[PDB]
Amino acid sequence: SMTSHSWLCDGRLLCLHDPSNKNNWKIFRECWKQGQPVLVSGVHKKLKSELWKPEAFSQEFGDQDVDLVNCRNCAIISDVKVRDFWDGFEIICKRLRSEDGQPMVLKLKDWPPGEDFRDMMPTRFEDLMENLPLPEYTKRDGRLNLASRLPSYFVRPDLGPKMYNAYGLITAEDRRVGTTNLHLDVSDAVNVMVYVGIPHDEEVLKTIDEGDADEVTKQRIHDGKEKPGALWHIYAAKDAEKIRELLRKVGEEQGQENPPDHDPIHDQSWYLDQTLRKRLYEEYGVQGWAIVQFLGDAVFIPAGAPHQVHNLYSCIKVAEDFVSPEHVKHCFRLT
Ligand SMILES: Oc1ccc(-c2nnn[nH]2)c2cccnc12
Ligand SMILES: [Cl-]
Numbered sequence: 441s442m443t444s445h446s447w448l449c450d451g452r453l454l455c456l457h458d459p460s461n462k463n464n465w466k467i468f469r470e471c472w473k474q475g476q477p478v479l480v481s482g483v484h485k486k487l488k489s490e491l492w493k494p495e496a497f498s499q500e501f502g503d504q505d506v507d508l509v510n511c512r513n514c515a516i517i518s519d520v521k522v523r524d525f526w527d528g529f530e531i532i533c534k535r536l537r538s539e540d541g542q543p544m545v546l547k548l549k550d551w552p553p554g555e556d557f558r559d560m561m562p563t564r565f566e567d568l569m570e571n572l573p574l575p576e577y578t579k580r581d582g583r584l585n586l587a588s589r590l591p592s593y594f595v596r597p598d599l600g601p602k603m604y605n606a607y608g609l610i611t612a613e614d615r616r617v618g619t620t621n622l623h624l625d626v627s628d629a630v631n632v633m634v635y636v637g638i639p640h641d642e643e644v645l646k647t648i649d650e651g652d653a654d655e656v657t658k659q660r661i662h663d664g665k666e667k668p669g670a671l672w673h674i675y676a677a678k679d680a681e682k683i684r685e686l687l688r689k690v691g692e693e694q695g696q697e698n699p700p701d702h703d704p705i706h707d708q709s710w711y712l713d714q715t716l717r718k719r720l721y722e723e724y725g726v727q728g729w730a731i732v733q734f735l736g737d738a739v740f741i742p743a744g745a746p747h748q749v750h751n752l753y754s755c756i757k758v759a760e761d762f763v764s765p766e767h768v769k770h771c772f773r774l775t
């Protein structure tokens with residue numbers, strides 16, 4: 441890369457430019473220790489692109505049974521063949537349709553299942569795990585990954601990467617919907633965008649704009665000609681309780697009958713649309729990071745940080761959990 445790094449979100453987000461640069465840790469840990477997310481671009485240039493095509497997954501694994509989620513209403517489509525998901529990944533009229541006759545925005549639920557990623561896809565496992573940025577943090581045996589070094593007094597993450605596959609959201613009403621709703625995790629994670637399917641183009645730019653993307657990010661589209669995959673909103677762990685207080689208030693306003701100690705973040709049932717994000721800012725002073733994850737971008741999510749994901753197009757992401765020393769406190773089981 442020409443330069444080692446830059447700053448997105450108007451200076452508030454570190455963006456590293458070379459995913460394999462051995463000096464990345466120096467500037468990374470400076471921002472990581474403050475509870476900030478970090479972005480690393482260019483990972484797709486390190487991978488074998490033919491291994492991350494939706495057509496290839498359908499051909500090699502199409503006969504497996506899976507469950508799908510209708511992102512618009514959270515309904516579950518049970519016990520279908522995974523080729524039913526992949527064959528509609530980019531051709532809309534091949535997609536399963538809802539009772540109202542429209543093609544559904546679908547998320548592939550838990551595939552490969554559990555910890556089976558490595559067993560099912562050995563070559564994809566090697567291709568990714570050998571090219572993850574900041575390897576001392578992210579690799580299973582990295583010197584700064586405590587995942588395999590902590591006693592049972594800490595919540596320890598399951599093994600192997602996960603794959604997250606979902607169609608892109610389309611309409612203006614979809615703008616209030618999430619691919620993955622707001623929640624937090626007790627460990628750190630890195631999430632890599634390995635494929636974006638770009639066949640609506642007007643609503644994508646509008647969604648990015650209303651999502652509060654910065655102008656440098658928008659220039660990655662119009663000048664850099666990069667493919668935007670998903671819109672993230674990430675909030676600092678220290679603001680989690682204020683977010684809960686907002687979502688308890690809104691829930692009551694909407695007639696939900698919840699006990700006063702209800703945890704709407706763990707519930708994973710909310711997506712902060714433009715109205716709620718503006719309200720979170722005006723009434724609680726909480727500001728987040730609005731991140732557009734492009735092809736090859738690796739999003740680093742700090743433990744305890746609430747975060748939500750909104751697919752702009754159909755995406756294939758792969759994520760790996762790890763436990764950094766900076767944030768090990770978030771998986772400790774005692775107060
Ligand atoms: O912590 C997370 C971050 C992003 C995602 C995700 N990435 N693309 N689509 N969904 C996700 C999915 C399930 C569980 N946790 C997740
Ligand atoms: Cl490292």
Ligand SMILES: [Mn+2]
Binds near residue numbers: 623624625
């Ligand atoms: Mn998660």
